[PDB]
Amino acid sequence: QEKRKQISVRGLAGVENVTELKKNFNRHLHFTLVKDRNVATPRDYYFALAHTVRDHLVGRWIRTQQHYYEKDPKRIYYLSLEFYMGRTLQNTMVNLALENACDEATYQLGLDMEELEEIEEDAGLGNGGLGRLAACFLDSMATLGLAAYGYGIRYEFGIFNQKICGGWQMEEADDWLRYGNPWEKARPEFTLPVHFYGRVEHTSQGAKWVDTQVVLAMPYDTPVPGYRNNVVNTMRLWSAKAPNGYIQAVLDRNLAENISRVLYGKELRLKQEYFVVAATLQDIIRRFKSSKFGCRDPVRTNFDAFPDKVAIQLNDTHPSLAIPELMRVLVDLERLDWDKAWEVTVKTCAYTNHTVLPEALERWPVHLLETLLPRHLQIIYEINQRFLNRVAAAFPGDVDRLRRMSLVEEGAVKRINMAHLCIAGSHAVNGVARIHSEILKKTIFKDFYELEPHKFQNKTNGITPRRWLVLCNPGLAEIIAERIGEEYISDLDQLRKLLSYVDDEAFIRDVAKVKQENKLKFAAYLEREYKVHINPNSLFDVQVKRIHEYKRQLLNCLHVITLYNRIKKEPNKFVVPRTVMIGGKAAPGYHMAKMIIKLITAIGDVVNHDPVVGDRLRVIFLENYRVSLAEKVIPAADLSEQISTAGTEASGTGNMKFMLNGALTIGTMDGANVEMAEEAGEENFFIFGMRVEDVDRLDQRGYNAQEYYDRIPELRQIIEQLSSGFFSPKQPDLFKDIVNMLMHHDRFKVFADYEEYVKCQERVSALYKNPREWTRMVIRNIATSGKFSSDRTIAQYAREIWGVEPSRQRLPAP
Amino acid sequence: QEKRKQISVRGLAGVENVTELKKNFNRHLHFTLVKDRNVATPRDYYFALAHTVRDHLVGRWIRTQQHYYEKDPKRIYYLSLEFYMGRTLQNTMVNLALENACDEATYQLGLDMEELEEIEEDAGLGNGGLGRLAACFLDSMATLGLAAYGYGIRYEFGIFNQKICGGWQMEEADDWLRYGNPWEKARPEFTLPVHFYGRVEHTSQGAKWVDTQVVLAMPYDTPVPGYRNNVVNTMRLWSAKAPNGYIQAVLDRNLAENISRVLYPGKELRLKQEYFVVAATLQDIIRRFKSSKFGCRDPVRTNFDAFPDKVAIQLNDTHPSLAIPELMRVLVDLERLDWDKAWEVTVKTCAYTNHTVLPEALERWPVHLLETLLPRHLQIIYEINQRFLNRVAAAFPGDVDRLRRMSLVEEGAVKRINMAHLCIAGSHAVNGVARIHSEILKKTIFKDFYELEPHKFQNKTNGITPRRWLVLCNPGLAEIIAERIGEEYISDLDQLRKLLSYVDDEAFIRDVAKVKQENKLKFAAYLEREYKVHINPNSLFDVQVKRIHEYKRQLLNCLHVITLYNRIKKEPNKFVVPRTVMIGGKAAPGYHMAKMIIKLITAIGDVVNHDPVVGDRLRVIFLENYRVSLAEKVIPAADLSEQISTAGTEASGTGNMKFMLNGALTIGTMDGANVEMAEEAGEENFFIFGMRVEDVDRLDQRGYNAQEYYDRIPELRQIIEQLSSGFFSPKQPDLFKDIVNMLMHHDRFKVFADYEEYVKCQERVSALYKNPREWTRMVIRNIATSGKFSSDRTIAQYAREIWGVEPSRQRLPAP
């Protein structure tokens, strides 16, 4: 029966117009959601619109996936334990070019689309930079036409929502799924077993992994759209499920399931890591084998073509177990011999390093691996012996480096170094900015570099101009499009054409006008949430990193208090009004970080209620900072704070976001700030403080905070205020911990950059006075931000690591 | 923004034609399922078709539910712990007259709709006749245009799938939900809390239930369509969810959650199940009562004076008996009414249906269990009991013995609360399930209550839906009936009376006989392509499909089969009327006797089916995994219907009505619903054998000794020898000693007593079967006289005599 060539997407799309969209929106409210207008809540109207947009998303998805099965390209598998997706609705509409049509449709139906947008929960799937880089990458990979996949874990509670109670961080569950996720599709049909524990039985045949405990992995598909090229790739997230003496099988059921429950560590983190690797790989091998278009059968069983058809990117060491897992499947199940299987593994795998210092590098005790992944241990020991023989022959009689490069690390209880596992198992290893990729070959991994120099590359991070310009900042996208068109949205380097407009009067005030417009929008939100009062004409001074000593929101605080003391000593002096905003989540259990949050709010209570200060200084702690808040605050920011101690940041990614939206930057010569300053010119940045070589020199002679205390009176004053209980009148000794750390054991040298930080902030105040000059510097920043598009990043990953050609040409259509 | 009048169901259904259906089948496969033809499986195409059909169903649902909100009718809530629904695909297509168009649509896309229909799981939400009754009841309530809801629990594990290996029943897990269920809709929005444990705090205010442990109940709605009248009602099933230092509150997760997982082959968990369904349902009822106004979800009404006018709760058996105390709890504790008004509201609101026959089967709970789990409800039950015993003490001054006989509290080993007594005290009506049944209720088990309030006690004889059990499952039969009398009979079964005119019509006789043979031929084929078999399709189709219980007497059947066998081996050349005797039903785990019975039936088969001399004259089949979908296949194919329960042990029966509707003649006892069936059909046109209820009483009176029969029936002794010496289990000679010793020494159910009258009655059957003309004339007489046994007739009576609403057979507008 060829009658079923009539089972097709052919003309299910419809015309994508106002007429068809509202008929569709009505289908979904009533037939999908089983509601009517009598009962429907705003959330229902959101779900009905989501499904209406989704029909058009999956139409193109079916087409893209078909195209892959008939073209048979190299498929690229992006592995991550964090996908920081944010909201989906507006993004799907801009990328499909449906925003105009939907806005009008919902309008004609009595609905307001901005309301409905604000109802969508942030996807509880990521935590910080690691996770948003993944999301930006997904969006760029689809825009550049790559057959790409995001594979991760579907977390049922993400990482906690942050609420501030009495100035203290409290954590609350993030049940972002409680009403369901319309963007996902459960696939009960593709449930796969993931094995734990057991023992290895040595048949003189192969090696069998027997007696194991089983956990079921069930996949959820979410489609991800390219920017107006009709390609729509897959994000595929695994959910843990249990199968069905004593009924302690209850414990086994509960323990199986909390693999999907939360982010962050015992067995659980390692359980989570194997889980994602083992399910993803079964999916990988399956597609490799069943490659003939229209044909479900496993037609291709020769693995010599595996590295030509599959690429696996290991985002940090979290998915590292992919290496020995791939080895397990090829040797044990597929019965290829060792050398042949290893060559395949190495050619398939690639590793990205994100972290800066040898101690954050992931390690697992042997006894743990031995108990839970006994076969994987053997495979790791085996990889290790042959890698160390390869080292032996390349560097004879060198016993020291031999044990320096070993995957097995000695001490009190042997640990296995997963970063060493990654380097040996992959054809490429990259760092995430230029300086970071350099210290990787200089220090952290020099022994490996000397063995295989070719392996080591750089790939500077980036940001999608979709979400981080066109979506969150329509005003700025617009005024740019009037001078140069909209080619820049998928080719950011074209922003340089804006350098022709540094001296155009109309453009300078249009940039100023858009900033002011975003400030007003955000200010209004900041009143109906924090119920204070923001001066929309003040300088919006923003710092939004995660709370942490090395990120130095304590250095910002000192500046805020310096500003407060000056205003109060001379209340008649003219001052540039400032709204300082600090946002970010503190890790539970990290006590100092919870203190830093309380300090920020404590200062707020004083400065926001001093009659003398008026509206010249406002301090706000931004609650529950996340992707959607970042979309609202980054556009409205004037000053971006990147003030980590030099030598501690690899990249940074939020800085790029600020640069794009017309904030000037105050930052240290560290991470992504270096290359940003390079692109823009030093004079268009506000760099201050010690460089990395200044840090080392201070370390070498010994850091004493007391030296700075003794010679800077304005600094002494603040400490005496923190000491005496000025900022916590009820509990005078509240900030005792902070003070004693600042004075006696500060690993991150806050006092040492204090002086230059405040002089710098003064130079920042002076520029702010002259809005023409201020804006012209902003234009120079914006015109010069093209490099930090993730379209540029993924194009490099594609050509230098993956061996696939980026392509901006359209896939046909449904 | 008065623009939202365009947010409407208006024209979203589209024309119910081949071209729209195939288009929408494409939308659903690709957009809803996120599949294409390259990856789709038969399962996927099933889901796609289901989603296509549901579209039309919910179109009518929205309208119906709107309609109720604007007429503000008395709304009726059918509460049950079982809903034995079966498949929904075909039933929805017939009730919405979409069957032909879907069939055509699927054909043109290169699919077989019958293949697709076979994919879908039987609804695993029920067990037996209790649950199947509710499903028929829902279908009827909707056809008769009643604002009716069906409330229960969404069970995940289903029940179990019967597998037969080596003649033994093995129970497999029936996870009918692993792939989802396109017919339901989840309502996370309407998640309600249910409370457990805690303690009661007496304040000079009211009483306060505090320190409780909380389980959340999430609803799932499923539409149920009337027959071509465009009204769609709701089935609303609850699912248990746990909320979100020691993790040992992992039990809390488990101990909740598996309230939903399982039916019960009773403990704390069983009672949690009952309170769960009740507390959630009552919150939902009151909620809907308060939201009386069209277009708005405001608590517009808080005057509970009209509650009994707007609400009817139907307590099906004692399982949801806690509705009564809970309804007192909400009204007194939460709505701060005074006890007297609330009680008057409670009694006028609830009514009780007893389904069982014996004083033993009925539900009691230890007080210490209630004291711990539902501490507030125990106090309320004690208060109810105090006041109810005041009415009794007033009615019968000084009759001390009846004060304790009628009490909700039973003294004994442990103090128990009697739920049957609770239901009779808190309801305005109580009904039996057949005439004989209802009569024994006022004569025996509730005699004391009947003397108190005789008017309380009604009969509502059970019934069956002519949609599922005629039109749907026997399309061949419904068609040849329609030719003579039209198709008005489908919602007015009485109209089948007009078939009596046609008893001597030769064309109708050959049509009825031809339809029968067609189904026989068709069911025999299903037997071949689904199992190793044989089956002479011309033989008399002898069918018993109950559940396996000593009282059901599939052993009386066995003894008859072996009787025949011996005769065929005594006189091989003497013509015997060929028979295929088929026995189906599930044992119930733990019941040691039932599993032995199944083994016995199969072990008989092994011998008989493979005996050369017997040939194709006698075949014995155990029918694996009996359920609604199989019922639909076997029932239309049956010639003879075994309803042979020991007299007075079956309350009604319901399968018996199915066989009668479908051209089978009945062999049965003067028991349950048979009494009324023979009353309609005429004694003449029914094979009624064995002791009557009063002969059973009289055998207990003189004492039952099975050895008497053994000694005066030579044909019976031989059968016992064969089972004992291992003629049916040569590898395990003593396999059936448990059965022998039960039959011979302690038969609670008198199998030997009816043995002789049974076998003679079977011979009159075999004789009549020899004359196809006369056999069919009798069949016609059964079918044509089946009208009483429509569940429509039943629901009408419930509506008019218990709920105080008027049935309406009129068509609601249209999409």
Ligand SMILES: Nc1ncnc2c1ncn2[C@@H]1O[C@H](COP(=O)(O)O)[C@@H](O)[C@H]1O
């Ligand atoms: N063998 C195939 N031929 C054509 N299309 C396919 C094939 N396998 C999968 N697809 C498409 O790719 C999608 C994703 O399937 P998979 O890659 O198997 O997870 C499916 O929805 C199909 O639309």
Ligand SMILES: Nc1ncnc2c1ncn2[C@@H]1O[C@H](COP(=O)(O)O)[C@@H](O)[C@H]1O
């Ligand atoms: N106040 C109302 N006015 C009109 N229709 C309603 C109203 N409340 C509920 N409905 C309809 O009845 C259905 C069931 O709602 P409920 O009775 O709240 O379970 C809803 O899906 C609506 O279609």
